[PDB]
Design a protein around this ligand. Structure first.
Ligand code: HEM
Ligand SMILES: *[C@@H]1O[C@H](CO)[C@@H](O)[C@H](O)[C@H]1NC(C)=O
Ligand SMILES: *[C@@H]1O[C@H](CO)[C@@H](O)[C@H](O)[C@H]1NC(C)=O
Ligand SMILES: *[C@@H]1O[C@H](CO)[C@@H](O)[C@H](O)[C@H]1NC(C)=O
Ligand SMILES: *[C@@H]1O[C@H](CO)[C@@H](O)[C@H](O)[C@H]1NC(C)=O
Ligand SMILES: NC[C@H](O)c1ccc(O)cc1
Ligand SMILES: [Ca+2]
Length: 595
């Protein structure tokens, strides 16, 4: 064991038996194993890690080390030969709104986050990766192949730093490297409220005992709130327009400002917390701030759970939904509610659903201004377009009226993500999320595509024609075998996303299984699930079900025309109704009288 820099948590905390609310960290959810699902613990390993050295090192690291007898291809080569495409025409999903993509990023962010170590690294090590493309320690650069346009204009590589892990702790037993999940595994609004005490406290409005989340003091949205700005230099949201000097938002999850629709969604969630606190106070003016914060949080946590499991999962999983996520039976305390490492790659299917543009739409759902449509890449780390240029209402309208990209075997990831991605700590709109996804797959020691096929009770192709029949695509299978030379060596991100979609869904069979299990586990294994007997009252539960994204939008913006089913492709004015024709969240059953 080399003296490599690493972060390892202790990390223990004590538990309260009677507590009616979740902890911030997610500790104490499970009584028998209180750290299960808590943040800052290892991602769970559904199958043993697969490293080149049966050790931390990742496949692709040493030149002369093969995987199953073949060299693994460069992540950027796979990306260029398989993931990329020119023509954006015909790629939109005729029956998914762009809100469908956006919820998935939201749900992803609630559940997992494996930050790189590099933030905790010496400046000489950061600059050595970028400036010289030299592989060492964490630094694991994505090298360009020879016929790559980025060679000519960017250098010999893209920088990349290995994910954080729980660092060797005694007895230096032979355990493979285990990456950290930095947020709570429970679907618990941790992206709004935080997964650590210190952040969760900074986000709160202490000053007024009304249980409010802190809001921006420097700017407002026709009176409605924005999240506070976050103080830290450098701020990537500053770097992208140094004239506008509008920093990133400060939210319960670090990645909130990564793109403008995510920030929009986080802004909707904040507002609902505050709206709930106010109305609860009215009902219960005797409740103090803590009680009002906790009861609102709890309501918002259920809201995310209902929207995800009632509205989102059925239309991702389609015909496999019932098989993996059958109706609820109550809290089972022997279920592992931890997020698996493989899930953090499975759920990147979202990436194939991101389209190349974003639109702002007026109150007649017509283009908001002369440059109302914008290219996705101009919107990475871009808070100024919100603050300065119309607020969230136009952006929300385009989440409703515009469409997600459909996954498609010869048009996988838009070039806005595949060539023009911006990352903090690098200066250029020049990165490739697909390449990064593959490198990270390796970084995490992921078993290859057949291991997971076999895990999920599915066949394991060994030849070209085997592969063709599974992918139902001769040319893609050809390109894959040319790169891999086998299917055992195909990285799970690209293998799982290549399979045609299941009926009524938007992922294939392998991903539906992987995702399927995970979500079933995080519902069944959660002591605070909204429907779990005892968490809410009977009467509370009849109000809670009524929720809808539509209602969330009406309540927290000045939009009055929304569809009933928001994840559907909805075209206005046909599929749009007056806000009034939509159910509310009835808060009466929260009035807790003396008697
Ligand atoms: C413009 C929209 C989006 C962009 C630019 C984006 C970009 C990124 C980037 C750069 C990462 C970190 C990659 C790494 O360091 O390994 C990431 C993480 C991730 N993204 Fe996205 N993403 C977007 C939306 C989505 C959507 C819609 C989904 C799925 C619905 C999704 C799923 C994920 C997952 C699962 C992770 C891994 C989180 C983890 O670290 O555990 N993302 N995204
Ligand atoms: C659109 O999708 C929903 C599932 O989200 C489905 O119920 C409906 O039939 C779909 N419409 C069409 C035309 O496929
Ligand atoms: C805290 O709430 C009070 C109203 O109760 C408000 O005037 C103040 O702006 C809030 N502070 C922050 C930082 O949101
Ligand atoms: C920067 O923001 C200002 C407004 O604050 C705007 O007029 C300008 O076009 C923006 N520039 C870029 C390069 O995005
Ligand atoms: C609880 O989960 C475990 C997982 O192995 C399973 O064996 C058992 O069927 C579950 N119990 C109930 C009552 O659902
Ligand atoms: N927070 C900055 C970083 O580039 C990032 C941004 C967005 C993500 O979804 C994941 C990671
Ligand atoms: Ca969570």
């Amino acid at each position: 064991s080399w003296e490599v820099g690493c972060g390892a948590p202790v990390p223990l905390v004590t538990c309260d038996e009677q507590s009616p609310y979740r902890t911030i960290t997610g500790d104490c959810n499970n009584r028998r194993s209180p750290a299960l699902g808590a943040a800052n613990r290892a991602l769970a390993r559904w199958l043993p890690a697969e490293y080149e050295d049966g050790l931390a090192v990742p496949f692709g690291w040493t030149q002369r080390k093969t995987r199953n007898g073949f060299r693994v291809p460069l992540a950027r080569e796979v990306s260029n030969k398989i993931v990329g495409y020119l023509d954006e025409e015909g790629v939109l999903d005729q029956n998914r709104s762009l809100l469908f993509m956006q919820w998935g990023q939201i749900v992803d962010h609630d559940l997992d986050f494996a930050p790189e170590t590099e933030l905790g690294s010496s400046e000489h090590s950061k600059v050595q990766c970028e400036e010289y493309c030299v592989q060492g320690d964490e630094c694991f650069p994505i090298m360009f192949p020879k016929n790559d346009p980025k060679l000519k204009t960017q250098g010999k590589c893209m920088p990349f730093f290995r994910a954080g892990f729980v660092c060797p702790t005694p007895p230096y037993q032979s355990l493979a490297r285990d990456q950290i999940n930095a947020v709570t595994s429970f679907l618990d609004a941790s992206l709004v409220y935080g997964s650590e005490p210190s952040l969760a406290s900074r986000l709160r409005n202490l000053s007024s005992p009304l249980g409010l989340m802190a809001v921006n003091q420097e700017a407002w949205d026709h009176g409605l709130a924005y999240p506070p700005f976050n103080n830290v230099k450098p701020s990537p949201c500053e770097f992208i327009n140094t004239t506008a000097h509008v920093p990133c938002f400060q939210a319960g999850d670090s990645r909130a400002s990564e793109q403008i629709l995510l920030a929009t969604v986080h802004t909707l969630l904040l507002r609902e917390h505050n709206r709930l606190a106010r109305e609860l106070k009215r009902l219960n003016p005797h409740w103090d701030g803590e009680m009002l914060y906790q009861e609102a949080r709890k309501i918002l946590g259920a809201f995310i759970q209902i929207i995800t499991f009632r509205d989102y999962l059925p239309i991702v999983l389609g015909s496999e939904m019932q098989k993996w996520i059958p109706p609820y039976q109550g809290y089972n305390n022997s279920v592992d509610p931890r997020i698996s490492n493989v899930f953090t790659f499975a759920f990147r299917f979202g990436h194939m659903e991101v389209p190349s543009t974003v639109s702002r739409l007026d109150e007649n759902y017509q283009p908001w201004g002369p440059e109302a449509e914008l290219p996705l890449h101009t919107l990475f780390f871009n808070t100024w377009r919100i603050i300065k240029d119309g607020g969230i209402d136009p952006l929300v309208r385009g989440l409703l009226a515009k469409n997600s990209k459909l996954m498609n075997q010869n048009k996988m990831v838009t070039s806005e993500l595949r060539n023009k991605l911006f990352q903090p700590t690098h200066k250029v709109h020049g990165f490739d999320l697909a390449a990064i996804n593959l490198q990270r797959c390796r970084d995490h020691g992921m078993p290859g595509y057949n291991s997971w096929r076999g895990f999920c009770g599915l066949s394991q192709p060994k030849t070209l024609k085997g592969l063709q029949a599974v992918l139902k695509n001769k040319v893609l299978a050809k390109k894959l075998l040319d790169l891999y030379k086998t299917p055992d060596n195909i990285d799970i991100w690209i293998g799982g996303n290549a399979e045609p979609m299941v009926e009524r869904g938007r992922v294939g069979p392998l991903l539906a299984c992987l995702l399927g299990r995970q979500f079933q586990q995080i519902r069944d294994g959660d002591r605070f699930w909204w429907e779990n007997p005892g968490v809410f009252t009977e009467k509370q539960r009849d109000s809670l079900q009524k929720v809808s994204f539509s209602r969330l939008i009406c309540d927290n913006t000045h939009i009055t025309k929304v569809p009933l089913h928001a994840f559907q492709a909805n075209n206005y004015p046909h599929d749009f109704v007056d806000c009034s024709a939509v159910d509310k969240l009835d808060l009466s059953p929260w009035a807790s009288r003396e008697n």
